[PDB]
Amino acid sequence: STLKHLAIIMDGNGRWAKLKNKARAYGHKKGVKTLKDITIWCANHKLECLTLYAFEVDFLMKMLKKYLKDERSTYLDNNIRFRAIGDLEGFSKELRDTILQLENDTRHFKDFTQVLALNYGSKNELSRAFKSLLESPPSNISLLESLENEISNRLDTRNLPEVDLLLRTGGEMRLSNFLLWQSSYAELFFTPILWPDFTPKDLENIISDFYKRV
Amino acid sequence: TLKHLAIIMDGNGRWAKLKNKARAYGHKKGVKTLKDITIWCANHKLECLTLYAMKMLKKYLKDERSTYLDNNIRFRAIGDLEGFSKELRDTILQLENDTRHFKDFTQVLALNYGSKNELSRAFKSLLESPLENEISNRLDTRNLPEVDLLLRTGGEMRLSNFLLWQSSYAELFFTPILWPDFTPKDLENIISDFYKRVRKFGE
Incomplete structure (x- = not known):
């Protein structure tokens, strides 16, 4: 309806494990679970787009690819379109291929x-969108004065609705170079709840307040 | 470490309807707030203060020219100045x-400003006359530091197309206080909070 695109900055995974005197890796696992729970909830409640800010380095790209392979079924199952934004060029061929x-x-x-935002950074994304116009400008570029519409479609998020509600778990109140362009008019919410302890119920309350604001 | 403070001045209209008066009275009051906050930031050694902001503007630039000079305050405008009259543009420049x-x-003062539009003008500039840092220096704010603290008065919680690129890592603050009621004192509590936050992430 009024809430079509929800974007979430998942934070508090490491800090979570710590508070329970546990291994950081243990926190990132519950985080991944919450992620599945949250996407399914959203899919089941008629939401059009859900964007998650996700991201030795050679090993983490291997867990991702195994991860994406693990859940390949759960997408196709629930009929969820997968999409990835960020600089994929910085990934191994094996990974960038599992994603594509x-x-x-x-x-x-x-x-x-x-x-899923992977190796994603708003300034970078906008930089790449620029590099795209310098390499492949639009025919009527000479007759143009405003490039907002040109830029919007060169962005990794081309054809995705603008962010309606941007949420950040973990207590911090910064944007962290996440969907800056796409969130220029998004309703901002913040909560101290660590990501792993974030449940779909919390999401409901927050969405309830969203409408109140509107 | 607090060098650049950006503020979205909002709530001038609600303040007016509340006091049962026309918007003009609210904006009139909001100009005093602007002046007081500005002078306050100068006295406390901030490096830059950016405010998100017709007949009133030319008037402001006219009657306040004196306070900018007395207080050693450098004036700078950002936004699309083209859309302004030949007379208004002169006063500003x-x-x-x-x-x-x-x-x-x-x-x-962000006048006729749009964050998406500013990025659009810098891009056009680059194409025309030729990464992240190159785009940055083509922005209206090119010589100023990144935003450290972006505050929004009025109660709303959204950036509203304001300094999106320049505020990517800024600490966000929201206050229900309407711009005309906002005082240097409110600003101080906020700045104390900003430092408490800066101390908490390192723990």
Whole structure:
């Protein structure tokens, strides 16, 4: 309805494990679970887009690819379109290929899309969109004065609705270079609840307040 | 470490309807707030103060020219100045010129400003006359530091197309206080909080 695109900055995973005198890796696992819970909830409640801010380095890109392979079924199952934003060029060929794969094998699900920000940075994304216009300018570029519409479609999020509600768990109140362009008019919410302790119920209360604001 | 403070002045209209008066009275009051906050930031050694902001503007630039000079306050405007009259543009440019010698504190009024539009003008500039840092220096704010604290008065919680690129890592603050009721005292509590926050992430 009024809330079509929800974006979430998942924070508090490490800090969570710590507070329970546990290993950081243990926190990132519950975090990943909450992620699944949150995307399914959203898919089941008619939301069009859900964007998650996700991100030796050679090993983490391997866990991702194994991760994406693990959940490949859960997407196709619930009919969730997978999409990835960020600088994919910085990933291993093996990973950038699993992603482009999962993306294409889910392109048809046009009702609810789950977007993962991987090796993503708003300034960088906008930089790449610029590099795109310098390499492939639009024919009527000489007759143009405003490039906002040109820029919007060169962004990784091309064809995705603008962010309606941007949420940050973990207590911090910063944007952290996340969807700056796409969140220029998004309703901002913040909560001290660590990501792993974040449940779908919390999401409901927050969404309830969203409408109140509107 | 608090060098650049950006503020979205909002709530001038609700303040007016509340006191049962026309918007003009609220904006009139909001100009005093602006002046007081500005002078307060100069006295406390901030480096830059950016404010998100018709007949009133030319008037303001006219009657306040004196306080910018007395207080050693450098004036600078950002936004799309083209959309302004040939007369309004002169006052603005002239004021930037009559104050360019001040180097300690700078006050930036965002006039006819849009963050998406500013990025659009810098891009166009780059194409025309040729990464992240190159785009940055093409922005209206090119010579100022990144925003450290972005505060929004009025109660609303959204950036509203304001300094999006320049505020990517800024600490966000929201206050229900309406711009005309906002005082230097409110600003101080907020700045004390900003430092408490800066101390908490390192723990």
